[PDB]
Amino acid sequence: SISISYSTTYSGWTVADYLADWSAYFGDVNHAPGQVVDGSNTGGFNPGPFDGSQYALKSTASDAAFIAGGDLHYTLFSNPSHTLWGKLDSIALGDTLTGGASSGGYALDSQEVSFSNLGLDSPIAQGRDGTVHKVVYGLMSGDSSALQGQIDALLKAVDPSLSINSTFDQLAAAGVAHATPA
Template identity: 40%
Template sequence: MSVSVTYDPIFGSSTIDDYLAFWTTGFATAGHGQSNTGGFSNGTFSGDQYATSGANGSDYAFIADSDASNGLHYVFNPALPANSNQNHYLYGQLDNVSLGYELGGGGGSDFTLSNYVVTFSGLDLSAALGAGRTGNEVHETIYGLMQGNTDALESVLDDLFAAYGVSTDDTFDVVAAALAAGPLSTGSAELVGVPELVDDLALAA
């Protein structure tokens, strides 16, 4: 699967790291707890999408999406301690992550984001039942986002972008040009800027 990034052109001269820091700042009030456990778009412990908004009134949010039907799963085993590596973890197929503002949908319909939206597609992460928390990129990426921490996502992106000679240290436009030119070795990718017609989008200083 090819990697792609969809972004508002207003972010074109900003680095991907700048955007991730911008989103994190807005989401950082969330932490992780009863008010920030998130949920699946079409199920209780499994679904196509998993999403949550920041807690404490934050409207910043993320959507973790699988291209496979019912492709993401959460393990809750009351017979195991809460801190067990085999309890409270996510597994399945994670293909796309969207970061943005104002989460909508759910309850049987796809989640949506209305503003500040950037979508990273073609992540191609997978973990099987029994993977646990440790070394499970699906869990680490989503759980990190639940905490307002983009480190795991950034690591995944840098691994994917390396084939094109760019990284999250580069601007969206530079990454776009590199992806359009093609990989330095094998594979293919594309990056598309999608205007959202939002007048007041701006990265925080």
């Protein structure tokens, strides 16, 4: 089942409100044709260059950042082009990205919320339709809708009274979330 970790700062927020606010603030990095700039809006893989156990990206306008964890593969120019696929186990959101391949991994100096045990897997053949791609490219583009939909389904699978409209504290009481210090 999904497992959520949240800073106590967000105890009274709904998951949906938190994600809407976080993604709007992170913004759209404009990772799109004619606009990709290495070291600005590509993000990076650990160990990389285009595959690994983590993909991480900092916003182009602030130190907000996320880390996707699992067993990830980015096709780049290979068919189907520009597809992130593989196994997505976790998404961590916060600010102040640290580390990288040369450090052995990425971390957030302020990790606000993480969603783990997501159990998502997308085959290469689905291309940019795959859930993994939609979740992560959504975040890159300042749009948490795809992530929200996957979290909502995972919460319903625990109990249909649980949803992204639950607060983090409600989810803790329901056995799927735990608080961390602010």
